[PDB]
């Protein structure tokens, strides 16, 4: 197979990068590179069997892997071009988050090497039904098709708003939306019936939202606000995908981070405003009205 050869090439590229990264808190390239390579070897061995490939055609296992491996190559070239034989720290942090996402997606859809994209179930039932009714057995769609299918229920305005949506949904920055990425998005921005209003209120129009930040980056950022107890920001958790991590400055100026209950974020923020904890988004004066 061409696919066999592509998988071989990917494993070799991640071994090069692993060796070039020999010089720690999650997400860490040092951890993720060999973990991804080990998972790809498992996929390679599993693809050698008859069936188990699931329902065929666009958006199936073979399509997913063609797109995933091409993206993995592009991301791996970015990391290589950056590594020596702070801008660099930020570029590598963003790429670590992307690699954490690519590993989590491959583990979700090919655990132990074995494809389950046609059986995968989303966490929120309304979103699960939308995916299976709209996309069928497929586990992956190009962005443009996904925007169109999503728009049967939740249309987004073309241009900057749609592009911001794409940036939020596309965890792996591949240009394609997997059923795993849609699971994460619909958990973060529940509840379903107002999905894109929730996303506009939280991820476009809220000063407390940060995208693609690590735990250590939020610990550093909020130190600017340590003399303003009540200051807070929120960002997606890197290690518990689909959940929020709220960073806030406590009464004594300590920067803490907490993962909410499985509740709409708007509710968690409204209750924490009432209780006097989440008051000054990103340390700014104006807390937006989430009613």
């Amino acid at each position: 197979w061409e696919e066999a050869r592509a998988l071989g090439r990917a494993v070799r590229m991640l071994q090069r990068l692993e060796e070039q990264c020999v010089d720690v808190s999650p997400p860490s390239l040092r951890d993720l590179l060999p973990r991804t390579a080990q998972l790809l070897r498992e996929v390679a061995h599993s693809r050698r069997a008859a069936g188990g490939g699931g329902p065929g055609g666009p958006g199936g296992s073979g399509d997913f892997l063609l797109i995933y491996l091409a993206n993995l190559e592009a991301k791996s070239r970015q990391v290589a071009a950056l590594l020596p034989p702070s801008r660099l720290r930020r570029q590598l942090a963003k790429l670590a988050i992307i690699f954490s996402h690519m590993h989590a997606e491959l583990h979700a859809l090919f655990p132990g090497g074995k494809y389950c994209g046609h059986m995968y179930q989303l966490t929120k039932a309304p979103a699960h039904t939308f995916w299976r009714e709209s996309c069928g057995a497929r586990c992956v769609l190009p962005w443009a098709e996904f925007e169109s299918l999503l728009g049967t229920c939740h249309p987004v305005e073309p241009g900057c708003t749609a592009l911001a949506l794409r940036t939020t949904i596309d965890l792996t920055c591949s240009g394609h939306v997997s059923i795993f990425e849609f699971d994460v998005f619909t958990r973060l921005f529940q509840p379903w019936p107002t999905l894109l209003k929730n996303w506009q209120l939280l991820a476009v129009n809220h000063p407390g939202y940060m995208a693609f930040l690590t735990y250590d980056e939020v610990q550093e950022r909020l130190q600017a606000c340590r003399d303003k107890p009540g200051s807070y920001i929120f960002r997606p958790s890197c290690t518990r995908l689909g959940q929020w991590a709220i960073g806030y400055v406590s009464s004594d100026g300590s920067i803490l981070q907490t993962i909410p209950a499985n509740k709409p974020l708007s509710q968690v923020l409204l209750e924490g405003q009432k209780d006097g904890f989440y008051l000054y988004p990103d340390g700014k004066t104006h807390n937006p009205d989430l009613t």
Binding site: Y215, Y248, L256, Q257, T258, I259, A261, G272, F277
Partner: peptide
């Protein structure tokens, strides 16, 4: 641990 309890 990194992630602490709900300040309420």
């Amino acid at each position: 641990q990194r992630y602490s309890s709900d300040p309420t």
